[PDB]
């Protein structure tokens, strides 16, 4: 499709803020290098048929979008720096104030139909401002931009650089940068320090932590290209796959999280799509909020990064024999990621001679493996500027096989959505799987 950039600029804070280098905690290191991309789509109508223009007939007017934008940048200041190093050659974030950049662009000829169900294919990254990588501290920390489409259909595409802030406490911008644009005050304000993340001293990790170890290659004795899916199940679906794992009575555990149940399902469609033989180990990768494992909990409004990551790992023939029998070995993983386990970690990665060794990327998902990642509890249906809050919300286009995303659905129907990424052959048998059951 035709899409033109119809104006670029960055954007700074509105007011003075901190110049000041930020301390990067262990888990604000082990994240990818560019940004993480992520999509909002916003329809004209509410489906009720209700114009959804402002009485001023704006719709995602980009003047008042980056004027909030500039005030979110206040509180939010280190949104606006740029990545340095510290003496010892540690990334940190430099506060600079040097900005974040926002588009506008048209889509002519275009509906955001043409998205169709949304699936994170490679598409979507036309959606997102191109970043200049050539250098780690020229590009900036965030960009944005906004798509006006034919029949007035809007994308705002979210690139972020992770070092300065996870999954959650990037929504708590967007939203706080929405708040601000629909004239509503800041309900959170953001509590930079990420000090409470240091390690022990001195480090004294009690597990191995698997979940930063080498994943396990496919057994021995070019690269396939890699199809992207989005696939819906119904509360109802949900419902039914829940009851055919039988609840942990004689045990007298609790049930299954409905978390380990899909997750277990999708693990072991994709395992049987990938035609994996019983004795072939293969290594799941949940990322796990920290906020609240940790004890005392972190501060409410904390920015940065507190994710830790459980990862079931077990021989297909477990995973693949039943949902059941997979969904034991997950939760058991969830489960032991409580404040020990977590603080643990830090002093693990502490203990690291190189943090970006340890940085995951197409060769961690790669069959066997698989990563999955919740949304389920984020609050990413609630960036409503003025004009409506998104139909969808999902992952700005998945590069490479392995990656799976669970998402709740905008119209509060109790239904969820898995985007996935799998080799093409692979997807093939996954689409003829997904609803066996």
């Known amino acids: 499709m035709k899409i033109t950039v119809r104006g670029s600029e960055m954007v700074y804070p509105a007011a003075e803020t901190p110049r000041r280098r930020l301390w990067n905690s262990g888990p604000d290191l082990v994240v990818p290098r560019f940004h993480t991309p992520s ?12 114009d959804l223009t402002a009485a001023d007939g704006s719709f995602f007017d980009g003047a008042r979008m980056r004027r909030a934008l500039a005030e979110a940048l206040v509180p939010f200041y280190p949104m606006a720096g740029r990545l340095a190093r510290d003496e010892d050659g540690r990334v940190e974030i430099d506060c600079n104030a040097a900005g974040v950049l926002f588009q506008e662009a048209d889509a002519p000829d275009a509906t955001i139909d043409y ?5 994170p294919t490679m598409e979507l990254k ?3 401002p191109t970043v200049d990588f050539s250098d780690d501290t020229a590009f900036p920390l965030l960009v944005l931009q906004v798509t006006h489409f034919k029949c007035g259909g809007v994308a705002i595409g979210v690139g972020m650089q992770h070092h300065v802030a996870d999954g959650f406490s990037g929504l708590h911008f967007i ?5 601000l644009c629909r004239g509503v005050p800041i309900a959170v304000m953001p509590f930079i320090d990420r000090s409470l993340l240091r390690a022990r001293d001195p480090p004294a990790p009690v597990y191995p932590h698997v979940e930063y170890q080498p994943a396990p290659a496919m057994l021995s004795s070019a690269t396939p290209p890699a199809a992207v899916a989005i696939f819906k199940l119904s509360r109802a679906e949900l419902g039914r796959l829940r009851s055919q794992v039988p609840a942990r009575e004689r045990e007298g555990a609790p049930r299954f999280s409905t978390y380990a ?6 693990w072991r469609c994709a395992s049987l799509a990938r035609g994996l033989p019983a004795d072939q180990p293969t290594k799941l990768y949940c990322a796990t909020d920290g906020r609240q494992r940790l004890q005392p909990p972190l501060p409410e409004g904390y920015f940065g990064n507190v994710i830790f990551t459980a990862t079931p790992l077990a021989n297909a023939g477990t995973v693949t024999a039943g949902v059941a029998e997979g969904a034991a070995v997950i939760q058991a993983a969830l489960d032991r990621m409580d404040d020990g386990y977590c603080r643990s970690a830090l002093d693990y990665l502490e203990l ?3 943090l970006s060794a340890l940085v995951r990327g197409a060769h ?3 069959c066997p493996n698989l ?5 389920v509890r984020l609050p990413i249906h609630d960036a409503d500027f003025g004009w409506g809050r998104p139909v969808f919300m999902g992952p700005g286009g998945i590069a490479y096989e392995g990656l799976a995303f669970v998402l709740p659905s905008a119209n509060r129907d109790g239904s969820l959505s898995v985007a996935i990424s799998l080799q093409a052959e692979h997807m093939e048998k996954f689409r003829k799987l997904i609803y066996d059951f």
């Open 371 to 375: 990563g999955l990642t919740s949304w």
């Open 175 to 179: 939203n706080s940068w929405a708040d």
């Open 261 to 266: 149940v899909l997750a277990a399902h999708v």
């Open 39 to 50: 999509v909002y789509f916003f329809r004209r109508r509410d489906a009720d048929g209700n």
């Open 126 to 128: 036309r959606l997102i």
């Open 364 to 366: 961690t998902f790669r």
């Open 352 to 354: 690291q001679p190189d």
């Open 115 to 119: 998205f169709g169900d949304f699936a």
